[PDB]
Scaffold this active site. Structure first.
Site, short mmCIF file in Angstrom:
data_model
loop_
_atom_site.label_atom_id
_atom_site.label_comp_id
_atom_site.label_asym_id
_atom_site.label_seq_id
_atom_site.Cartn_x
_atom_site.Cartn_y
_atom_site.Cartn_z
N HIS A 264 0.75 -0.76 -0.09
CA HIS A 264 -0.23 -0.25 0.01
C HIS A 264 0.99 1.68 -0.14
O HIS A 264 0.42 2.56 -0.23
CB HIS A 264 -1.10 -0.40 1.29
CG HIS A 264 -2.76 0.10 1.44
ND1 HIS A 264 -2.95 0.47 -0.26
CD2 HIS A 264 -3.13 1.62 1.75
CE1 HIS A 264 -4.16 0.51 -0.02
NE2 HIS A 264 -4.26 1.44 1.43
N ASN B 188 -6.97 6.41 4.93
CA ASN B 188 -8.38 6.76 5.03
C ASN B 188 -8.41 8.84 5.07
O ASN B 188 -10.09 8.86 4.75
CB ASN B 188 -8.35 6.11 6.40
CG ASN B 188 -10.02 5.55 6.25
OD1 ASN B 188 -10.55 4.69 5.25
ND2 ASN B 188 -10.76 5.65 7.27
N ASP C 80 -0.87 1.48 -5.61
CA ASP C 80 -0.77 0.63 -6.34
C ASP C 80 -2.27 -0.25 -6.76
O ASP C 80 -3.32 1.06 -6.10
CB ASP C 80 -0.86 -0.46 -4.11
CG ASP C 80 -1.49 -0.16 -3.29
OD1 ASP C 80 -1.33 1.49 -3.44
OD2 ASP C 80 -1.76 -0.77 -2.53
N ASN D 174 -8.89 2.37 -1.00
CA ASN D 174 -9.27 3.64 0.60
C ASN D 174 -8.61 4.84 0.01
O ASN D 174 -9.03 5.96 0.11
CB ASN D 174 -9.36 3.27 1.42
CG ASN D 174 -8.03 2.33 2.31
OD1 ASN D 174 -7.06 1.74 1.41
ND2 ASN D 174 -6.88 3.17 3.18
#
Length: 191
Positions: free
Chosen positions: A22, A70, A95, A116
């Site tokens: 990530h 987030n 990614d 996200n």
């Protein structure tokens, strides 16, 4: 007399995530900053880490949010307004699960996959019409959930070639800025 492009690398802050899947966005951004020649400094009016300079023939503002995936939208949004950057001039590196490991795709708008961070960005900007440099990571092994998979480190066999991939993503990014989407994606795509 400017109107730069905003290049955003997505990832999570701290040593804990530095090497997870990530964080590909951060890795690429660190390479780009290394091409510009300056280290990141905190942009105090937005709280984001930023680098400004010349990249690929034009003016760029390179950024890394130092807030969790987030809530990235919270810093990317303010940063975009700070420089009066239109969504079409925003490039987000991240990614991508829907693409095989080692593949790089470029896209304008469209879906956000399971990312996200991307959702938070499009949510803050009020639009999904910004560019993305999608760096493939592949799909998780078996029944492992996507969200969990990307928070893990690369397998030893993958780690061998992440450095090669990050450099290609950075080139792909520079190619996009200089040449435009269509030329760039015609060069970088293959199937």
């Amino acid at each position: 007399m400017a109107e730069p492009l905003l290049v955003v690398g997505l990832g999570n802050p701290g040593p804990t995530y530095a090497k997870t899947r990530h964080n590909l966005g951060f890795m690429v951004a660190d390479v780009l900053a290394g091409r510009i020649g300056s280290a990141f400094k905190v942009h105090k009016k937005s709280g984001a880490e930023v680098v400004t300079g010349r990249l690929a023939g034009t003016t760029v503002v390179l950024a890394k949010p130092r807030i969790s995936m987030n809530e990235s939208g919270r810093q990317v949004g303010p940063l975009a307004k700070f420089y009066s950057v239109p969504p079409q001039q925003i490039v987000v590196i991240h990614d991508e699960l829907d693409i095989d490991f080692g593949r790089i795709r470029l896209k304008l708008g469209g879906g956000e996959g399971g990312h996200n961070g991307l959702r938070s960005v499009a949510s803050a900007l009020g639009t999904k019409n910004f560019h993305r440099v999608r760096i493939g990571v592949g799909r998780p092994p078996g029944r492992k959930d996507p969200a969990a998979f990307v928070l893990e480190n690369f397998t030893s066999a993958e780690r061998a070639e992440v450095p090669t991939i990050v450099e290609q993503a950075a080139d792909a990014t520079e190619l996009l800025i200089a040449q435009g989407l269509e030329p760039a994606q015609n060069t970088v795509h293959a199937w």
